[PDB]
Amino acid sequence: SQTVLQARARSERDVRGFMKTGLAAEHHRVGHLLNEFLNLALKLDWQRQMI
Amino acid sequence: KRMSEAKRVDTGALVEAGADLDDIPVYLQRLQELTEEALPEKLNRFLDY
Amino acid sequence: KRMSEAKRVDTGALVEAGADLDDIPVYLQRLQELTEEALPEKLNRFLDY
Amino acid sequence: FRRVEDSWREADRALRQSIIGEQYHRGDIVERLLNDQDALLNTPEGRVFD
Amino acid sequence: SETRTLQKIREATQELLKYGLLEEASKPNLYRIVLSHPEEVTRILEPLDLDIGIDEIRGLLYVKVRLDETPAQDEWAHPLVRRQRLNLEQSLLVAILRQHFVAWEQESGTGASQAQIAIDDLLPQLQIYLGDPGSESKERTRLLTLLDQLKGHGLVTSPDAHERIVIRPIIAHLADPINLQALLAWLREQIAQQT
Amino acid sequence: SETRTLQKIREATQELLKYGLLEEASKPNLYRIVLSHPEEVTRILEPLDLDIGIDEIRGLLYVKVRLDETPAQDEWAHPLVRRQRLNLEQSLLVAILRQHFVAWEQESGTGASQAQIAIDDLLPQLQIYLGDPGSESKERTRLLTLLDQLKGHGLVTSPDAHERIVIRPIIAHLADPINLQALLAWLREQIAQQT
Amino acid sequence: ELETARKQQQSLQPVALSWEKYQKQERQLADWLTLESLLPLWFAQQASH
C-alpha cells in the first residue's frame, strides 16, 4: 500500500507547488505564457525521436 | 479604512496598488478572482481529506 | 491611512480605540507615554542587561 | 493490490497532465483533487483499500 | 609605442567571450571591470558581429549575436558561436526550469543566484511529457543527459553531491516573454500543420 | 554611434577565426581582403591578445597569440585557445607529415606546390610503427579517423576520390618542432630496437 | 492557503459593498450638480417672459 500513499503524496506535491501563485505582474504574465506553452507541449508525439 | 484593512492581509497582489479610490478597480478585480475561485468553500472538505 | 498603518504594528494599546478623528486623543496618550517613559526605560533595561 | 496500486498511479498521472491546463484555476485544482481521490476510493478496488 | 587596450579590460573581455556570460555574484571584480567601461567592451565586440547585454538587478552580463545586418535566418549560423542550436526537449526542460526560477524569484525577488532545486522534482514533470520508460534509473539518466546539454548551453550548474542544481540567471533572458511568445506562435503553427 | 566596420573585413575576420587560417588557393576573397587590410584586422584582434602572421609564398595566413614572448611566464595559457596534446598516434602521424612536407618543399622550393600523399604510401609507414590493429579494414578506419581529426585541426584535407590527401601549408608553423624531432628520434630508435 | 484566502475574501467583500454605497452617492450628486449649471438660465428665461 505504500506505493498508493506515494502516488497520493506525489500528486499533493504538485498541488502545493501550484497553489502558490499570488505573483507580481511580470511573473503573472510569463506564468500564463509558460502554462499555455506546456498545454501546447502535450499534444506533440514525444515518443518519436525525429519529432 | 476598509481598503487599508484589506491590505493588512494581502499576500503579493494588492501591494502593487495604492490604498485609495483610484486603485479600487484592482481590488475589485481581486475580489472577483477570489469569489469566482470559491476556494473558501472547500475548507471543511479539505480538512477532512 | 497613517493611523491605520500604526494599528498594524500595535501590540495592545491602539486596538482598543477606533480609527477616526475622535480617537486621536488616545493615539496622543500612547505616543507621549512612549516617548516620555517607555523608550527611555526600555533602552536602559536593554543596555543594563 | 497489484491493481489498486496501478489505479492510484493512473489517477495521479491524470491529475498531473490535467493540472497543466491553463483553463484550470486554483479552485478547479482543489476540486479536482478531492473528486479524483473520492472517485478512486469509490471504485471496487477503492473499497478494498479502504 | 603601439596602443594596447587596458590589460584588465582585455582579460575581462576574453574571459567573458570564453564563457559567454558572467555573474557579479561569482566573479565580482570582472563584472565591475566591464561595468566600468561598457562602451569599451561593446566596441571590442563590434567587429565580431557580437554584442553585449546587461541585467544590473540580477548582476549578469551576457553576450548576444549582433543583428544589425546579419541574416535574419538564424543567428546560430554565425561562425564563431560554437554550441549548436537548441531543441524542443531542451526547450521543455527550459520551460520547467524557467517556471521553477520565477517561483524562486517570487520568494525573494531577484535575490541571489541560488535558485536551488532537487533533481527528484524534475523527473515527475518530464515523465508526463516524455512518458514513462518504466525504469526510474533510465529516466534519471535521460534527465541528466538533458541537464548536461543545458549546462553546455550555460543555463544550469552541473549536479552536486545533494542531487541539487542551481538555475543560471541567463535563463531569464532566453525565456524572455518575447522569445516565449515567438516560440509559442511557432509551435502553434507546428501543431496546426500537424493535422 | 560608432561607424560599422567594413562588412567584408568582418566576414574575413570571423571566417579566419573559424579556422585560424586563410589560403589564397581556396578563398582568394578573404585572403585578399586581409592582405590589403592588415592594420584593421590586427587592431581588431588586439583586445583579445590575437595576431596574424603570413607567408605569401605559401599563400597562407594564420592566427597566433599576440602576447609578447615570455611576458611573465615561460609558456602561455590563453582563455580562448586550448592547447591540446596529441596522443602518440597523432603525434607520429603529424611528425611524418611534417617531414614529408619539408621534404616536398626541398623538392619544389617554398610554397611552390601543396604537398600530397596517398593512402598507398601512408598505410605502410603507419603500420611500420603501430603494427596491425586487427585487420586491413581497421587499418584504414584508424588512418581515416586520424586524418579527419587532423583536418579538424586544419593540418590536412580529406582524401580525394583517388585517396590522396593534401598537406596543408600551415604545418610549417607548428609550436615545438624540437619535441617532434625528439619523438621522431625515439621512434626511429624503437623501429630498429624492436626488429 | 485556504484559510488565508478565506480571510482575504472576507476582508475584500466589505470594501466592494462600501464602494457600491459610495458610487451610488456619486451618481446621485452628478445630476444634482447638473441642476446648478441650469437653474440660472431657467430663471433668466422665466424673467424674460
Tell me the three state secondary structure of residue E51. Answer: strand
The amino acid that residue E3 corresponds to is T
Q: Which of B1, B8, B20 sits opposite C8 (nearest CB)?
A: B8
For an interface test with B, give the residue of G4, G6, G9, G10 to mutate (most B CBs within 10 A): G9
Longest dimension (CA), chain A: 43
> What DSSP assignment string belongs to chain F?
-PPPPPHHHHHHHHHHHHHTEEETTT-HHHHHHHHH-HHHHHHHHGGGTEEEEEETTTTEEEEEE-SPSSSSSSS--BTTB------HHHHHHHHHHHHHHHHHHHHH-SSSS-EEEEHHHHHHHHHHHH---SSHHHHHHHHHHHHHHHHHTTSBPPP-TTSEEEE-GGGGG-S-HHHHHHHHHHHHHHHHHT-
Q: How far apart are the first and last CA of chain F?
A: 71
Q: Give the bridge partners for E170, in sequence order.
A: none
Min Cα–Cα distance to chain E from A50, Å? 11
- Residues D34, B37: C-beta atoms closer than 8 Å: no
The Cα–Cα gap between E120 and E125 comes to 10
Whether residue E130 lies within 8 A of chain A, CB to CB, comes out as yes
Whether residue B12 lies within 8 A of chain D, CB to CB, comes out as no
3-class secondary structure for chain D?
A: CCCHHHHHHHHHHHHHHHHCCCCCCHHHHHHHHHHHHHHHHHCHHHHHHC
Q: Give the bridge partners for F63, in sequence order.
A: F52
Tell me the three state secondary structure of residue E52. Answer: strand
Cβ atoms of F162 and F86 closer than 8 Å: no
Min Cα–Cα distance to chain B from G36, Å? 26
Resolution (A): 3.7
Q: State residue F2 phi and psi, 5-degree precision.
A: -70, 135
Q: Which chain E residue is nearest to residue A47, measuring alpha carbons?
A: E130
- Other beta carbons within 10 Å of B46: 14
Q: How far apart are the first and last CA of chain G?
A: 72
Three cell numbers, residue D35: 473528486
Tell me the three state secondary structure of residue E54. Answer: strand
E strands in E71-132:
116-118
Three cell numbers, residue E43: 566596441
Contacts of E124 in chain D (CB under 8 A): 16
Q: Which chain A residue is nearest to residue D16, measuring alpha carbons?
A: A11
Contacts of C8 in chain B (CB under 8 A): 8
- Residues A40, E188: C-beta atoms closer than 8 Å: yes
Q: Which of A3, A18, A39 sits opposite D5 (nearest CB)?
A: A3
Distance of CA E34 to the CA centre of its chain: 19
Q: Which of A11, A32, A39 sits opposite D20 (nearest CB)?
A: A39
Tell me the three state secondary structure of residue G27. Answer: helix
The Cα–Cα gap between G45 and G32 comes to 20
Cell 488565508 belongs to G4
Tell me the three state secondary structure of residue A49. Answer: coil
Instruction: Please name the chains neighbouring G, where neighbouring means 3+ C-beta pairs under 8 angstroms.
Output: B
Angle at F14 (CA atoms; ends F147, E54), nearest 5 degrees: 125
Contacts of G3 in chain B (CB under 8 A): 43
Length of chain C as a residue count: 49
Min Cα–Cα distance to chain F from E122, Å? 34
Contacts of E44 in chain F (CB under 8 A): 47-48
Three cell numbers, residue F147: 586524418
Q: Which chain B residue is nearest to residue C9, measuring alpha carbons?
A: B8
Q: Which of E106, E188, E190 sits opposite A23 (nearest CB)?
A: E106
Contacts of E79 (CB under 8 A, 6+ apart): F14, F15, F17, F18
Min Cα–Cα distance to chain B from C2, Å? 10
Contacts of E128 in chain D (CB under 8 A): 13, 16-17, 20
For an interface test with B, give the residue of C1, C14, C22 to mutate (most B CBs within 10 A): C1
Min Cα–Cα distance to chain E from F10, Å? 6
CA atoms within 13 A on the CB side of F162: 6
Q: Which of G5, G6, G15 sits opposite B27 (nearest CB)?
A: G15
Whether residue F79 lies within 8 A of chain E, CB to CB, comes out as yes
Find, among E146, E109, E110, E106, the residue nearest to E125 by Cα: E146
The helix (run of H) or strand (run of E) holding residue E23 is: strand E21-23
Angle at E185 (CA atoms; ends E76, E71), nearest 5 degrees: 30
- Residues E175, A30: C-beta atoms closer than 8 Å: yes
Length of chain B as a residue count: 49
Min Cα–Cα distance to chain D from B4, Å? 26
Q: Which chain F residue is nearest to residue E69, measuring alpha carbons?
A: F7
Experimental method used, please?
cryo-EM
Q: Which chain D residue is nearest to residue A38, measuring alpha carbons?
A: D20
**Sign (positive/negative) of CA torsion B4, B8, B12, B13?**
negative
- Flag whether E touches A (3+ CB pairs, 8 A cutoff): yes
Q: Which chain F residue is nearest to residue E80, measuring alpha carbons?
A: F18
The Cα–Cα gap between E82 and E77 comes to 9
Long-range own/partner contacts, residues E146-154 (CB < 8 A, 24 or more apart): E146/E89, E146/E90, E146/E93, E147/E93, E149/E90, E150/E90, E150/E93, E150/E94, E150/E97, E152/E83, E153/E83, E153/E86, E153/E90, E154/E19, E154/E20, E154/E21
The helix (run of H) or strand (run of E) holding residue E65 is: strand E60-65
The Cα–Cα gap between E157 and E143 comes to 14
- Residues A24, B11: C-beta atoms closer than 8 Å: no
- Flag whether C touches F (3+ CB pairs, 8 A cutoff): no
